Copies of this chain bind each other. A is one copy, B any other.
Amino acid sequence: MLPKELLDATRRRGKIYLKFASEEHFRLARAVILAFKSSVGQKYEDLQEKLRHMERAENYRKVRGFAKILERESEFTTSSSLDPLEVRRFLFSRGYVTSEIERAKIIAEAATYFNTTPEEIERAMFADREEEKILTRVPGISEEELIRRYNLSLLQTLMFNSARMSFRVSENHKRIFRLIKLLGLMYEISGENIEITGPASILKMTRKYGTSMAKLIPEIVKAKEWAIKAEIIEDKRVYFFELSSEDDILLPKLEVSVEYDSSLEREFVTKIKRILGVEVIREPGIIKAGQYAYIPDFLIRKNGKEVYVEIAGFWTRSYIKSKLEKLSNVDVKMLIIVNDELLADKLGKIHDVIVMRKGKIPYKEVILKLKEMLN
């Protein structure tokens, strides 16, 4: 997101700061709301011209950013009951493109065929263009909520260029750990500090990973106390970013779920249990190993031995190799399964982990490794 970086952040002495909106921007937020309200019943093109007219060097980014929020929560509709594709099909089959003088006549024939007026045909002809969509509903969002959502969006946008983002929260740890796993994030826990590998630390799937990462931020800033630190890469330059609840930035408290099902969990247990003669506990709980903590998917036990199993999300070779070294100096035994469709990195020799095939777990390989680990 180049534009935002060069324009809604400031860089100084190796640090990067975001140009958050505050109560000082109340009048600007209201002016954007008024531009949307005035454009109800009009084409998106007319709304955009209103926004361009109010834009000045000083307010340009916030006008754009506020309007992006309102547009996302607004309802647009096509301007005609007619199908634009069927209208154009009819017109083009009667020679519309190869005519010039005859076009008004061809439009009049269409109006008879579709039981309407020439003006309705003309409205329908290109009604599938985005510029032609009609604003029909504007959300009932206050200036303050607009400013809060803009600031959350800005914080999320910055994290698309993060090499790593670390945070602490005063509560909601259980939900956050569940979110990290559902979102497939690369994580590291040390004490109260939770470090998320960012998209500037992967080779591919950057937008997909960054989008997933961004869904975690609304849950962080909902805690009564929280602190974020991040390392940001911009071309060959690096910057340190830091924000906490004590900075009193206006931010929302948005509902976050992005939930799932326990189908694989049950499928995995049912496939391993009697085959292996083993006890399996699903989501057994955070396990501490040395100075680090892990969020395993399964605990597998037989005789007096134990093996934790964790299914990674997005991954790179450097991330998995680092995780493996950290687990090698500790008593816990852990089997990591990595998905080949989530490799955000070059293909390489990675041992000690089990690799999926086309997104499916290889159960015989898992069974044999587990047998070897459990004896």
Binding site for B on A (CB under 8 A): 13-14, 83, 85-86, 88-89, 92, 96-98, 100, 125-126, 128-129, 131, 163-164, 201-203, 231, 235-236, 238-240, 316-319, 321-322, 345-346
Contacts and interface: CB of A to CB of B under 8 A. Distances in A.
Contact of A85 (B14, B131, B202, B235): B202
In this complex, the member of A13, A97, A345 whose beta carbon has the largest number of chain B beta carbons within 10 angstroms is A97
A324 to B, nearest CB: 13
Given A85-B345, A318-B83, A92 B236 contact: no
Given A97-B240, A129-B236, 5 more contacts: A85-B201, A85-B316, A85-B319, A86-B318, A88-B163
Contacts of A131: 235
Contacts of A203: 85, 128
Nearest to A195: B93
Contact of A89 (B85, B128, B201, B238): B201
A96 B164 CA distance: 13
A100 B13 CA distance: 9
Nearest to A164: B92
A317 to B, nearest CB: 7
Contacts of A88: 163, 201
Given A318-B85, A322-B89, A97 B239 contact: yes
A98 B129 contact: no
B231 A318 contact: no
A322 B201 CA distance: 51
A86 B126 CA distance: 52
B98 A240 contact: yes
A235 B89 contact: no
